[PDB]
Protein backbone atom coordinates (compact mmCIF):
# COMPACT_ATOMS: atom_id res chain seq x y z
CA UNK A 1 0.00 0.00 0.00
CA UNK A 2 3.01 2.28 0.43
CA UNK A 3 6.26 3.00 -1.39
CA UNK A 4 9.75 2.50 0.08
CA UNK A 5 12.61 4.00 -1.94
CA UNK A 6 16.37 3.65 -1.40
CA UNK A 7 18.90 6.11 -2.84
CA UNK A 8 22.58 6.66 -2.15
CA UNK A 9 23.56 9.19 0.49
CA UNK A 10 25.38 11.45 -1.98
CA UNK A 11 22.14 12.09 -3.92
CA UNK A 12 19.43 14.63 -3.22
CA UNK A 13 17.26 12.34 -1.11
CA UNK A 14 15.47 15.36 0.39
CA UNK A 15 14.25 16.48 -3.02
CA UNK A 16 13.13 12.92 -3.69
CA UNK A 17 11.30 13.04 -0.36
CA UNK A 18 9.59 16.24 -1.51
CA UNK A 19 8.51 14.46 -4.71
CA UNK A 20 7.19 11.65 -2.52
CA UNK A 21 5.26 14.21 -0.47
CA UNK A 22 3.70 15.54 -3.68
CA UNK A 23 2.79 11.98 -4.67
CA UNK A 24 1.19 11.51 -1.25
CA UNK A 25 -0.74 14.77 -1.65
CA UNK A 26 -2.07 13.71 -5.06
CA UNK A 27 -2.81 10.08 -4.08
CA UNK A 28 -2.57 9.83 -0.29
CA UNK A 29 0.13 7.16 -0.60
CA UNK A 30 2.92 7.65 1.94
CA UNK A 31 6.33 7.62 0.24
CA UNK A 32 9.34 6.84 2.44
CA UNK A 33 12.78 7.76 1.07
CA UNK A 34 15.86 6.32 2.79
CA UNK A 35 19.62 6.45 2.22
CA UNK A 36 20.87 3.25 3.87
CA UNK A 37 24.55 2.92 4.66
CA UNK A 38 26.41 0.52 2.37
CA UNK A 39 23.49 0.66 -0.06
CA UNK A 40 25.46 -0.77 -3.00
CA UNK A 41 25.91 -4.10 -1.23
CA UNK A 42 22.88 -3.78 1.05
CA UNK A 43 20.30 -3.80 -1.74
CA UNK A 44 21.20 -7.16 -3.37
CA UNK A 45 21.36 -9.15 -0.11
CA UNK A 46 17.99 -7.90 1.13
CA UNK A 47 16.41 -8.23 -2.32
CA UNK A 48 17.58 -11.84 -2.60
CA UNK A 49 15.27 -12.69 0.33
CA UNK A 50 12.18 -11.05 -1.17
CA UNK A 51 12.62 -7.93 0.98
CA UNK A 52 14.00 -4.43 0.45
CA UNK A 53 12.64 -1.24 -1.07
CA UNK A 54 10.04 -0.90 -3.79
CA UNK A 55 12.35 1.34 -5.87
CA UNK A 56 16.17 1.35 -5.95
CA UNK A 57 18.33 4.15 -7.36
CA UNK A 58 21.78 3.34 -8.70
CA UNK A 59 24.08 3.36 -11.71
CA UNK A 60 22.72 1.22 -14.53
CA UNK A 61 25.90 -0.86 -14.74
CA UNK A 62 25.09 -2.78 -11.55
CA UNK A 63 21.41 -3.24 -12.42
CA UNK A 64 22.27 -5.73 -15.17
CA UNK A 65 23.58 -8.14 -12.57
CA UNK A 66 20.52 -7.44 -10.44
CA UNK A 67 18.46 -8.35 -13.51
CA UNK A 68 20.35 -11.64 -13.92
CA UNK A 69 19.53 -12.58 -10.32
CA UNK A 70 15.85 -11.73 -10.79
CA UNK A 71 15.94 -8.81 -8.35
CA UNK A 72 14.46 -6.30 -10.82
CA UNK A 73 11.06 -6.29 -12.50
CA UNK A 74 10.49 -5.43 -16.14
CA UNK A 75 9.14 -1.92 -16.64
CA UNK A 76 6.37 -1.24 -19.17
CA UNK A 77 6.66 2.35 -20.44
CA UNK A 78 4.57 3.19 -23.49
CA UNK A 79 5.91 4.76 -26.67
CA UNK A 80 4.76 8.23 -25.62
CA UNK A 81 6.76 8.09 -22.39
CA UNK A 82 9.77 6.44 -24.03
CA UNK A 83 9.84 9.38 -26.45
CA UNK A 84 10.32 11.73 -23.48
CA UNK A 85 13.83 10.38 -22.76
CA UNK A 86 16.90 10.19 -24.95
CA UNK A 87 17.17 6.77 -26.67
CA UNK A 88 20.76 6.21 -25.53
CA UNK A 89 19.59 6.48 -21.92
CA UNK A 90 17.05 3.71 -22.59
CA UNK A 91 19.86 1.66 -24.14
CA UNK A 92 21.62 1.77 -20.76
CA UNK A 93 18.70 0.15 -18.89
CA UNK A 94 18.23 -2.83 -21.23
CA UNK A 95 19.15 -6.35 -20.12
CA UNK A 96 18.29 -9.58 -21.96
CA UNK A 97 16.15 -7.51 -24.32
CA UNK A 98 13.92 -6.12 -21.55
CA UNK A 99 13.79 -2.73 -19.86
CA UNK A 100 14.67 -3.12 -16.18
CA UNK A 101 14.97 0.48 -14.94
CA UNK A 102 13.96 4.07 -15.68
CA UNK A 103 16.89 6.34 -16.65
CA UNK A 104 17.16 9.35 -14.34
CA UNK A 105 20.52 11.09 -14.78
CA UNK A 106 23.44 10.95 -17.21
CA UNK A 107 27.08 11.35 -16.17
CA UNK A 108 30.29 11.45 -18.22
CA UNK A 109 33.73 13.02 -18.29
CA UNK A 110 34.35 16.46 -19.79
CA UNK A 111 37.30 18.72 -20.59
CA UNK A 112 37.74 21.38 -17.89
CA UNK A 113 39.89 24.28 -19.09
CA UNK A 114 41.19 27.45 -17.45
CA UNK A 115 39.74 30.41 -19.34
CA UNK A 116 42.44 32.81 -18.10
CA UNK A 117 45.22 30.53 -19.38
CA UNK A 118 43.28 29.04 -22.32
CA UNK A 119 40.31 31.06 -23.59
CA UNK A 120 39.99 28.77 -26.64
CA UNK A 121 40.46 25.11 -25.68
CA UNK A 122 41.74 22.82 -28.45
CA UNK A 123 39.19 20.76 -30.37
CA UNK A 124 41.63 17.91 -31.15
CA UNK A 125 44.06 15.79 -29.16
CA UNK A 126 46.75 16.43 -31.78
CA UNK A 127 46.75 20.12 -30.81
CA UNK A 128 47.73 19.36 -27.20
CA UNK A 129 51.42 18.44 -27.77
CA UNK A 130 52.13 21.79 -29.43
CA UNK A 131 49.78 23.79 -27.19
CA UNK A 132 51.75 22.48 -24.20
CA UNK A 133 55.05 23.73 -25.64
CA UNK A 134 53.60 27.25 -25.59
CA UNK A 135 52.37 27.02 -21.99
CA UNK A 136 55.68 25.51 -20.86
CA UNK A 137 57.31 28.73 -22.07
CA UNK A 138 55.14 30.50 -19.46
CA UNK A 139 55.78 27.97 -16.69
CA UNK A 140 52.47 26.14 -17.15
CA UNK A 141 51.23 22.85 -18.60
CA UNK A 142 48.47 22.21 -21.12
CA UNK A 143 46.81 19.14 -19.60
CA UNK A 144 46.93 17.05 -16.43
CA UNK A 145 44.40 14.33 -15.61
CA UNK A 146 44.26 11.02 -13.77
CA UNK A 147 46.22 8.39 -15.71
CA UNK A 148 46.08 5.73 -12.97
CA UNK A 149 42.49 4.68 -13.79
CA UNK A 150 41.37 3.30 -17.17
CA UNK A 151 38.12 5.23 -16.67
CA UNK A 152 40.10 8.38 -17.50
CA UNK A 153 42.38 7.12 -20.29
CA UNK A 154 39.79 5.08 -22.22
CA UNK A 155 38.22 8.12 -24.00
CA UNK A 156 41.44 8.75 -25.93
CA UNK A 157 42.32 5.07 -26.33
CA UNK A 158 38.94 4.04 -27.78
CA UNK A 159 38.31 7.21 -29.80
CA UNK A 160 39.06 5.59 -33.18
CA UNK A 161 37.62 2.09 -32.81
CA UNK A 162 38.24 0.82 -29.29
CA UNK A 163 35.44 -0.72 -27.27
CA UNK A 164 35.02 -2.91 -24.21
CA UNK A 165 32.39 -5.38 -25.45
CA UNK A 166 30.51 -5.48 -28.75
CA UNK A 167 26.91 -4.38 -28.22
CA UNK A 168 24.10 -5.36 -30.58
CA UNK A 169 20.41 -6.26 -30.30
CA UNK A 170 20.55 -5.09 -26.70
CA UNK A 171 23.14 -7.76 -25.91
CA UNK A 172 26.85 -7.73 -25.08
CA UNK A 173 29.05 -10.28 -26.87
CA UNK A 174 31.61 -11.20 -24.21
CA UNK A 175 33.65 -13.01 -26.88
CA UNK A 176 33.94 -9.80 -28.95
CA UNK A 177 36.28 -7.37 -27.17
CA UNK A 178 37.96 -4.56 -29.09
CA UNK A 179 40.84 -3.88 -26.70
CA UNK A 180 43.64 -4.66 -29.17
CA UNK A 181 42.13 -3.30 -32.40
CA UNK A 182 43.75 -0.61 -34.55
CA UNK A 183 41.89 2.27 -32.91
CA UNK A 184 42.94 1.31 -29.39
CA UNK A 185 46.53 0.83 -30.54
CA UNK A 186 46.58 4.29 -32.11
CA UNK A 187 45.00 5.91 -29.06
CA UNK A 188 47.41 4.41 -26.55
CA UNK A 189 50.29 5.12 -28.94
CA UNK A 190 49.28 8.78 -28.84
CA UNK A 191 49.00 8.68 -25.04
CA UNK A 192 52.43 7.08 -24.57
CA UNK A 193 53.87 9.55 -27.08
CA UNK A 194 52.48 12.38 -24.95
CA UNK A 195 54.13 10.79 -21.91
CA UNK A 196 57.44 10.34 -23.74
CA UNK A 197 57.57 13.92 -25.05
CA UNK A 198 57.13 15.15 -21.43
CA UNK A 199 53.80 16.80 -22.26
CA UNK A 200 52.41 14.48 -19.56
CA UNK A 201 53.72 12.51 -16.59
CA UNK A 202 53.00 8.80 -16.14
CA UNK A 203 52.79 9.13 -12.33
CA UNK A 204 50.07 11.80 -12.46
CA UNK A 205 46.97 10.67 -10.57
CA UNK A 206 43.66 12.18 -9.47
CA UNK A 207 45.11 14.12 -6.54
CA UNK A 208 48.03 15.57 -8.51
CA UNK A 209 45.86 16.62 -11.46
CA UNK A 210 43.19 18.12 -9.19
CA UNK A 211 45.76 20.10 -7.19
CA UNK A 212 47.54 21.28 -10.35
CA UNK A 213 44.37 22.49 -12.07
CA UNK A 214 42.75 24.03 -8.99
CA UNK A 215 45.96 25.99 -8.28
CA UNK A 216 46.18 27.36 -11.83
CA UNK A 217 49.29 25.36 -12.72
CA UNK A 218 47.82 23.45 -15.69
CA UNK A 219 45.53 24.85 -18.37
CA UNK A 220 43.32 21.75 -18.78
CA UNK A 221 42.15 18.56 -17.09
CA UNK A 222 39.58 15.83 -17.72
CA UNK A 223 36.94 15.25 -15.06
CA UNK A 224 33.26 14.76 -14.39
CA UNK A 225 30.69 16.81 -12.48
CA UNK A 226 31.78 15.54 -9.06
CA UNK A 227 34.90 17.75 -9.16
CA UNK A 228 33.09 20.96 -10.17
CA UNK A 229 32.35 21.88 -6.55
CA UNK A 230 36.04 21.78 -5.64
CA UNK A 231 36.92 23.99 -8.61
CA UNK A 232 34.25 26.45 -7.47
CA UNK A 233 36.04 26.68 -4.12
CA UNK A 234 39.32 27.32 -5.94
CA UNK A 235 37.88 30.39 -7.75
CA UNK A 236 39.52 29.31 -11.01
CA UNK A 237 37.81 30.92 -14.01
CA UNK A 238 37.07 27.55 -15.58
CA UNK A 239 34.85 26.18 -18.31
CA UNK A 240 33.62 22.69 -19.16
CA UNK A 241 33.49 21.56 -22.79
CA UNK A 242 33.65 18.54 -25.07
CA UNK A 243 36.59 16.16 -24.98
CA UNK A 244 39.14 16.65 -27.79
CA UNK A 245 38.74 14.53 -30.91
CA UNK A 246 41.31 11.99 -32.08
CA UNK A 247 41.83 11.47 -35.82
CA UNK A 248 38.58 13.42 -36.22
CA UNK A 249 36.57 11.01 -34.04
CA UNK A 250 34.99 12.04 -30.72
CA UNK A 251 36.46 10.78 -27.47
CA UNK A 252 34.32 7.96 -26.06
CA UNK A 253 34.15 8.30 -22.26
CA UNK A 254 32.20 5.79 -20.23
CA UNK A 255 28.62 6.91 -19.55
CA UNK A 256 27.05 6.31 -16.15
CA UNK A 257 23.25 6.37 -16.08
CA UNK A 258 21.66 6.79 -12.67
CA UNK A 259 18.48 4.75 -13.05
CA UNK A 260 15.55 3.68 -10.87
CA UNK A 261 14.62 0.00 -10.84
CA UNK A 262 11.55 -1.68 -9.37
CA UNK A 263 12.10 -4.52 -6.90
CA UNK A 264 10.96 -7.86 -8.29
CA UNK A 265 9.47 -8.69 -4.86
CA UNK A 266 7.35 -5.51 -4.82
CA UNK A 267 3.57 -6.14 -4.78
CA UNK A 268 3.11 -2.42 -5.50
CA UNK A 269 4.81 -2.19 -8.90
CA UNK A 270 1.99 -0.17 -10.48
CA UNK A 271 2.40 2.49 -7.78
CA UNK A 272 6.15 2.60 -8.47
CA UNK A 273 5.51 2.98 -12.20
CA UNK A 274 3.04 5.80 -11.56
CA UNK A 275 5.40 7.62 -9.20
CA UNK A 276 8.38 7.33 -11.53
CA UNK A 277 6.63 8.17 -14.80
CA UNK A 278 4.15 10.85 -13.74
CA UNK A 279 5.76 12.46 -10.67
CA UNK A 280 9.55 12.07 -10.67
CA UNK A 281 10.32 11.99 -14.41
CA UNK A 282 8.84 15.43 -14.99
CA UNK A 283 10.19 18.97 -14.92
CA UNK A 284 8.88 19.58 -11.39
CA UNK A 285 10.12 16.35 -9.79
CA UNK A 286 13.54 16.49 -11.42
CA UNK A 287 13.83 20.16 -10.45
CA UNK A 288 12.94 19.28 -6.85
CA UNK A 289 15.60 16.56 -6.73
CA UNK A 290 18.08 18.88 -8.45
CA UNK A 291 17.62 21.73 -5.96
CA UNK A 292 18.76 19.47 -3.10
CA UNK A 293 21.85 18.05 -4.83
CA UNK A 294 22.60 18.62 -8.54
CA UNK A 295 21.90 15.73 -10.90
CA UNK A 296 24.13 17.14 -13.64
CA UNK A 297 22.61 16.11 -16.96
CA UNK A 298 19.25 14.33 -16.97
CA UNK A 299 17.70 11.80 -19.34
CA UNK A 300 14.35 13.62 -19.55
CA UNK A 301 14.50 15.81 -22.65
CA UNK A 302 12.25 18.60 -21.37
CA UNK A 303 14.23 19.30 -18.20
CA UNK A 304 17.51 18.58 -19.99
CA UNK A 305 16.92 21.56 -22.29
CA UNK A 306 16.41 23.81 -19.26
CA UNK A 307 19.51 22.45 -17.52
CA UNK A 308 21.67 22.77 -20.65
CA UNK A 309 21.41 26.57 -20.48
CA UNK A 310 24.48 26.29 -18.24
CA UNK A 311 27.27 25.25 -20.66
CA UNK A 312 28.72 22.75 -18.16
CA UNK A 313 25.71 20.40 -18.17
CA UNK A 314 25.41 20.85 -21.94
CA UNK A 315 29.01 19.71 -22.39
CA UNK A 316 28.41 16.79 -20.01
CA UNK A 317 25.39 15.65 -22.03
CA UNK A 318 27.17 16.07 -25.37
CA UNK A 319 30.11 14.00 -24.11
CA UNK A 320 27.74 11.34 -22.74
CA UNK A 321 25.90 11.05 -26.06
CA UNK A 322 29.22 10.57 -27.88
CA UNK A 323 30.53 8.26 -25.14
CA UNK A 324 30.29 4.51 -24.60
CA UNK A 325 27.52 3.28 -22.31
CA UNK A 326 28.99 1.46 -19.33
CA UNK A 327 28.31 -2.27 -19.87
CA UNK A 328 26.11 -3.87 -17.22
CA UNK A 329 27.80 -7.30 -17.23
CA UNK A 330 30.20 -8.74 -14.60
CA UNK A 331 32.92 -9.30 -17.21
CA UNK A 332 33.73 -5.58 -17.10
CA UNK A 333 35.54 -6.36 -13.85
CA UNK A 334 38.16 -8.30 -15.81
CA UNK A 335 38.25 -5.45 -18.33
CA UNK A 336 39.09 -3.01 -15.52
CA UNK A 337 41.84 -5.33 -14.31
CA UNK A 338 43.17 -5.89 -17.83
CA UNK A 339 43.43 -2.49 -19.52
CA UNK A 340 44.75 -0.98 -16.29
CA UNK A 341 47.79 -3.26 -16.42
CA UNK A 342 48.30 -2.35 -20.08
CA UNK A 343 48.20 1.38 -19.33
CA UNK A 344 50.63 0.75 -16.48
CA UNK A 345 52.91 -1.28 -18.74
CA UNK A 346 52.60 0.67 -21.99
CA UNK A 347 53.07 4.01 -20.24
CA UNK A 348 56.08 2.71 -18.28
CA UNK A 349 57.85 1.81 -21.52
CA UNK A 350 58.23 -1.81 -20.39
CA UNK A 351 55.64 -3.24 -22.80
CA UNK A 352 54.69 -2.28 -26.34
CA UNK A 353 51.18 -1.10 -27.15
CA UNK A 354 50.69 -4.23 -29.27
CA UNK A 355 51.94 -6.47 -26.46
CA UNK A 356 50.01 -4.76 -23.67
CA UNK A 357 46.70 -4.52 -25.52
CA UNK A 358 46.89 -8.11 -26.78
CA UNK A 359 47.62 -9.31 -23.24
CA UNK A 360 44.68 -7.27 -21.92
CA UNK A 361 42.50 -8.69 -24.71
CA UNK A 362 42.38 -12.07 -22.96
Amino acid sequence: GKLVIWINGDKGYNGLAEVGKKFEKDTGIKVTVEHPDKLEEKFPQVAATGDGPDIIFWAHDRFGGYAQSGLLAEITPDKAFQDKLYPFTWDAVRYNGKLIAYPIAVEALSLIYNKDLLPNPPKTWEEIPALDKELKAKGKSALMFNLQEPYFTWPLIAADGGYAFKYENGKYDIKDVGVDNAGAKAGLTFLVDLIKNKHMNADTDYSIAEAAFNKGETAMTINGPWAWSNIDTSKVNYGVTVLPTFKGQPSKPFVGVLSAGINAASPNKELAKEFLENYLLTDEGLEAVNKDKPLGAVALKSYEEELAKDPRIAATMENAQKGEIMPNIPQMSAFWYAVRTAVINAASGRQTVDEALKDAQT
Side-chain angles (χ1 to χ4, degrees), residues 147-180:
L147 307 181
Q148 295 298 109
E149 276 302 294
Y151 173 88
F152 282 85
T153 56
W154 192 245
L156 169 56
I157 297 171
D160 201 39
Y163 57 91
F165 295 96
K166 181 68 172 66
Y167 177 99
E168 187 65 26
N169 317 298
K171 189 263 185 180
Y172 282 103
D173 185 7
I174 63 175
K175 297 179 291 191
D176 190 344
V177 167
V179 165
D180 78 333

Side-chain angles (χ1 to χ4, degrees), residues 14-37:
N14 284 325
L16 188 57
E18 182 65 26
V19 180
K21 294 290 180 67
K22 182 175 73 175
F23 187 70
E24 183 176 13
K25 281 185 175 68
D26 280 353
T27 68
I29 297 293
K30 174 76 186 111
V31 175
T32 61
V33 176
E34 310 272 7
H35 47 103
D37 199 12

Side-chain angles (χ1 to χ4, degrees), residues 297-333:
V298 306
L300 188 72
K301 300 182 184 168
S302 61
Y303 195 52
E304 182 65 26
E305 326 182 16
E306 173 69 12
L307 291 179
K309 296 171 176 181
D310 173 54
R312 292 183 291 113
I313 295 89
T316 299
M317 170 60 60
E318 159 157 26
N319 283 315
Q321 189 276 319
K322 290 165 168 173
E324 154 173 38
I325 289 170
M326 186 66 204
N328 59 358
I329 54 175
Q331 284 76 12
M332 275 305 287
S333 291

Side-chain angles (χ1 to χ4, degrees), residues 24 28 87 110 115 119 138 164 233 240 252 260 265 281 288 320 323 343 352 355:
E24 183 176 13
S110 295
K115 288 158 73 213
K138 308 191 305 206
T233 303
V240 182
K252 287 196 70 71
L281 302 171
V343 193
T352 306
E355 289 174 3

